[PDB]
Write an enzyme that holds these catalytic residues in place. Sequence first.
Site, PDB file in Angstrom:
ATOM      1  N   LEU A  38       0.801  -1.226   0.000  1.00  0.00           N
ATOM      2  CA  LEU A  38       0.000   0.000   0.000  1.00  0.00           C
ATOM      3  C   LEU A  38       0.834   1.277   0.000  1.00  0.00           C
ATOM      4  CD1 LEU A  38      -2.583  -1.143   2.752  1.00  0.00           C
ATOM      5  CD2 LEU A  38      -2.897  -1.240   0.251  1.00  0.00           C
ATOM      6  N   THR A  40       5.342   2.767   0.381  1.00  0.00           N
ATOM      7  CA  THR A  40       6.750   2.426   0.543  1.00  0.00           C
ATOM      8  C   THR A  40       7.544   3.650   0.982  1.00  0.00           C
ATOM      9  OG1 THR A  40       6.462   0.831  -1.254  1.00  0.00           O
ATOM     10  CG2 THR A  40       8.706   1.231  -0.513  1.00  0.00           C
ATOM     11  N   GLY A  44      10.873   1.354   5.389  1.00  0.00           N
ATOM     12  CA  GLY A  44       9.698   0.559   5.697  1.00  0.00           C
ATOM     13  C   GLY A  44       8.677   0.581   4.580  1.00  0.00           C
ATOM     14  N   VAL A 112      -8.020   1.212   6.352  1.00  0.00           N
ATOM     15  CA  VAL A 112      -8.973   2.258   5.971  1.00  0.00           C
ATOM     16  C   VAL A 112      -9.082   2.291   4.449  1.00  0.00           C
ATOM     17  CG1 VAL A 112      -9.646   4.665   6.347  1.00  0.00           C
ATOM     18  CG2 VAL A 112      -8.170   3.486   8.034  1.00  0.00           C
ATOM     19  N   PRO A 113     -10.081   1.626   3.854  1.00  0.00           N
ATOM     20  CA  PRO A 113     -10.059   1.408   2.396  1.00  0.00           C
ATOM     21  C   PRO A 113     -10.333   2.656   1.571  1.00  0.00           C
ATOM     22  CG  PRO A 113     -11.452  -0.219   3.548  1.00  0.00           C
ATOM     23  CD  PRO A 113     -11.210   0.927   4.495  1.00  0.00           C
ATOM     24  N   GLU A 116      -6.090   7.987   0.976  1.00  0.00           N
ATOM     25  CA  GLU A 116      -5.584   9.245   1.531  1.00  0.00           C
ATOM     26  C   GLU A 116      -6.448  10.430   1.127  1.00  0.00           C
ATOM     27  OE1 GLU A 116      -1.642   9.815   0.017  1.00  0.00           O
ATOM     28  OE2 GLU A 116      -0.782   8.045   0.955  1.00  0.00           O
ATOM     29  N   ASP A 155       3.550  15.443  12.228  1.00  0.00           N
ATOM     30  CA  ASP A 155       3.616  14.964  10.843  1.00  0.00           C
ATOM     31  C   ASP A 155       2.312  15.248  10.107  1.00  0.00           C
ATOM     32  OD1 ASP A 155       5.194  13.952   8.751  1.00  0.00           O
ATOM     33  OD2 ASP A 155       4.708  11.860   9.164  1.00  0.00           O
ATOM     34  N   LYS A 157      -0.002  16.253   7.335  1.00  0.00           N
ATOM     35  CA  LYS A 157       0.025  16.461   5.891  1.00  0.00           C
ATOM     36  C   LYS A 157      -1.131  15.661   5.296  1.00  0.00           C
ATOM     37  CE  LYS A 157       3.519  12.808   5.152  1.00  0.00           C
ATOM     38  NZ  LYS A 157       4.890  12.552   4.584  1.00  0.00           N
ATOM     39  N   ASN A 160      -1.343  11.709   5.304  1.00  0.00           N
ATOM     40  CA  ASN A 160      -1.491  10.948   6.540  1.00  0.00           C
ATOM     41  C   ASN A 160      -2.921  10.929   7.073  1.00  0.00           C
ATOM     42  OD1 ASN A 160       1.189  10.185   6.579  1.00  0.00           O
ATOM     43  ND2 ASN A 160       1.805  11.684   8.159  1.00  0.00           N
ATOM     44  N   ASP A 173       0.355   7.309  10.862  1.00  0.00           N
ATOM     45  CA  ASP A 173       1.789   7.621  10.891  1.00  0.00           C
ATOM     46  C   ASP A 173       2.163   8.446  12.119  1.00  0.00           C
ATOM     47  OD1 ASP A 173       4.490   7.947  10.402  1.00  0.00           O
ATOM     48  OD2 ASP A 173       4.284   8.729   8.371  1.00  0.00           O
ATOM     49  N   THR A 190       7.445  17.271   6.937  1.00  0.00           N
ATOM     50  CA  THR A 190       7.624  17.538   5.513  1.00  0.00           C
ATOM     51  C   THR A 190       7.769  19.045   5.275  1.00  0.00           C
ATOM     52  OG1 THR A 190       6.776  16.935   3.309  1.00  0.00           O
ATOM     53  CG2 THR A 190       5.183  17.797   4.884  1.00  0.00           C
TER      54      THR A 190
END
Length: 339
Positions: A38, A40, A44, A112-113, A116, A155, A157, A160, A173, A190
């Site tokens: 999902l 990369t 991780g 969570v299908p 984002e 974090d 953004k 996430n 995250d 970020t």
Amino acid sequence: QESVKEFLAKAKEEFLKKWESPSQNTAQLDHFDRIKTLGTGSFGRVMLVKHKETGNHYAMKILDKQKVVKLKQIEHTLNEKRILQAVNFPFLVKLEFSFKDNSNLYMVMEYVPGGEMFSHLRRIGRFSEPHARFYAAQIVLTFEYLHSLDLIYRDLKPENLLIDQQGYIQVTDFGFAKRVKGRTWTLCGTPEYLAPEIILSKGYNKAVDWWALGVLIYEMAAGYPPFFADQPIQIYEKIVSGKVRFPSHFSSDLKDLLRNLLQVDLTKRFGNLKNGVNDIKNHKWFATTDWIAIYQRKVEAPFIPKFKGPGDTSNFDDYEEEEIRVSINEKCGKEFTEF
């Protein structure tokens, strides 16, 4: 408001009980089937998995211990798992299991299908102010919760924030999340969302989350972030300049709220004043928001993601499917004893 004060008091009691006695080793890898990658990263990946005995789907975050060490992320990854196993709030992705083996660290989270918020925002261009406000209210409540536990998220953004089947936000995250009673100093986040005091290498506090909320609301409402530029050095120069240009279609209430969240002086920034989060919740831009109804998930969402079921991956993107190996020998055992 005493009922909110007593709610947050109980929330902190329950967090601290799990914080002081963290759970460990609550599953293992061969209890799950691998389905699809999902997302990369540098050290991780996140995988859709299915539990073999129950058939339930989860998102499994897998961190390579040797790469975490080299990228100097040891404390952050211990932070992420200790915090996630201790928190509980309607708009936070839930951690279901965690474990480690010779090579990797594993965090098995609710799937969570809907994907984002970033994908949906980029598809449509921008959100109307009521749509941006619905999401923004969930972040305000989530930061009120986290900050009352002395946690800084660090974090925020659009990537996430995942959209669930009811159209509500689930924050994922916690890699940069940290329990901080005073100041902290790590450079992380970020670039488009960094507060000026992070860029300037100062000791900073929870007000950096409220700055990031200002950036997120601006980007939801405009379609692009307030300090955009082609290279990070130019982004940083804009962030610390003290100026920001608002689209003419922004309401006067929205501009006023954003000037107070994107306040370069942290001692004058909304959320960091004597009245705390109430300066934000009482602002005219939120006058139509029923904060209890948001928390209780009784407000009809502006958008319901399209997906076929709990195993549908169509709202996430495609990545090269790479092997996940587990070495015969233990790596970095001492560093991750507490995980």
